[PDB]
């Protein structure tokens, strides 16, 4: 549940967005904000409801709220900044999948995929997806910085598709520094990933495991820890052996070469063959599913405005309004479930049985 104060914060954020989108609502019983004064209303509305996939709208907005310590103005500033930067890039990346990268011959992205530099390798003890990162296979020589960033964005969005209902909507990251050397070091993408993840994936980091760091890493760490927010800086734990990793991940997901039981082939990549993408061209069904979504979206807005004006928090009408918001939230996530085969090219995880949307 949520408290009085917290709910009022949530109501305020939805109110600001409603003012941007021209949704009737009265926010006094709980004009366009500075943070949203320079955004296009319908661009932002369509992009926001697209990026809503397997989390409920309330959970999506609460990530920003908690990221800004429950300060409404801070929260709406961060959310407007994200809406400005995101608009349609990421959605195109994740929906195109590896297939689009191959078809467009994006050499550096392809190289990163084929090295399996960063792969989703299972779930942690709290049911978060685990991205395994192996920096000993990194060379700044292998890709543009834009390429490395697009690759980063694709793996992070892939991870989001693994989020499980009733479990943290966040990703654990295992940096295996075995055999890492300064040949592999690249400060630019370090700092990119830090600031972009901080500004655009709030509350999306679960555990950050730095495993078998060599001595040459101590000075690197002295730099990176001063770029890190304190939130992330103690999401961070240094692990030395399989017994430490067991505190965070079960052996069935830990790669065999680390002492675990996961025998996934990390030295040879199998790219999506496209076998599972047959729904991508039945555009008629897809349009019907998107019409369903748009109807649910309008209903959710209407009910949400109702709930923001309703008094008191006692009311049986309040009971009903809350329950309706929950029901429409669930229906939106099921609708995304149904939409996914019609807009998203299958990833390697859809083929190897590990991802179910």
UniProtKB/Swiss-Prot annotation:
Catalytic activity: a 1,2-diacyl-sn-glycero-3-phospho-(1D-myo-inositol)(in) = a 1,2-diacyl-sn-glycero-3-phospho-(1D-myo-inositol)(out)
Subcellular location: Cytoplasm; Microsome; Endosome
Alphabetical UniProt keywords: Acetylation, Cytoplasm, Endoplasmic reticulum, Endosome, Lipid degradation, Lipid metabolism, Lipid transport, Microsome, Phospholipid degradation, Phospholipid metabolism, Phosphoprotein, Transport
Superkingdom assignment: Eukaryota
Pfam families, per the entry: CRAL_TRIO (PF00650), CRAL_TRIO_N (PF03765)
Residue ranges of domain CRAL-TRIO in the record: 106-266
Cellular component per GO, a single term: mitochondrion
GO biological process: Golgi to plasma membrane protein transport; Golgi to plasma membrane transport; negative regulation of fatty acid biosynthetic process; negative regulation of phosphatidylglycerol biosynthetic process; phosphatidylinositol metabolic process; phospholipid catabolic process; phospholipid transport; positive regulation of phosphatidylcholine biosynthetic process
GO molecular function annotation: phosphatidylinositol transfer activity
Entry-linked InterPro entries: CRAL-TRIO_dom, CRAL-TRIO_dom_sf, CRAL/TRIO_N_dom, CRAL/TRIO_N_dom_sf, PITP/CRAL-TRIO
Further details from the record: Present with 9600 molecules/cell in log phase SD medium.
General function of this protein: Non-classical phosphatidylinositol (PtdIns) transfer protein (PITP), which exhibits PtdIns-binding/transfer activity in the absence of detectable PtdCho-binding/transfer activity. Activates SPO14/PLD1 (phospholipase D1) by stimulating phosphoinositide synthesis via the STT4 PtdIns 4-kinase. Modulates ArfGAP function through effects on SPO14 activity. Inhibits phosphatidylcholine degradation by PLB1 (phospholipase B1). May also regulate post-Golgi membrane-trafficking events and have a role resistance to oxidative stress.
Subunit and interaction comment: Forms a complex with 2 TSA2 subunits. Binds phosphatidylinositol (PtdIns).
PANTHER family associated with the record: PHOSPHATIDYLINOSITOL TRANSFER PROTEIN CSR1, PHOSPHATIDYLINOSITOL TRANSFER PROTEIN CSR1-RELATED
UniProt family annotation: Belongs to the PITP family.
Name of this chain's protein: Phosphatidylinositol transfer protein CSR1
Species this protein is from: Saccharomyces cerevisiae (strain ATCC 204508 / S288c)
Record lineage: Eukaryota, Fungi, Dikarya, Ascomycota, Saccharomycotina
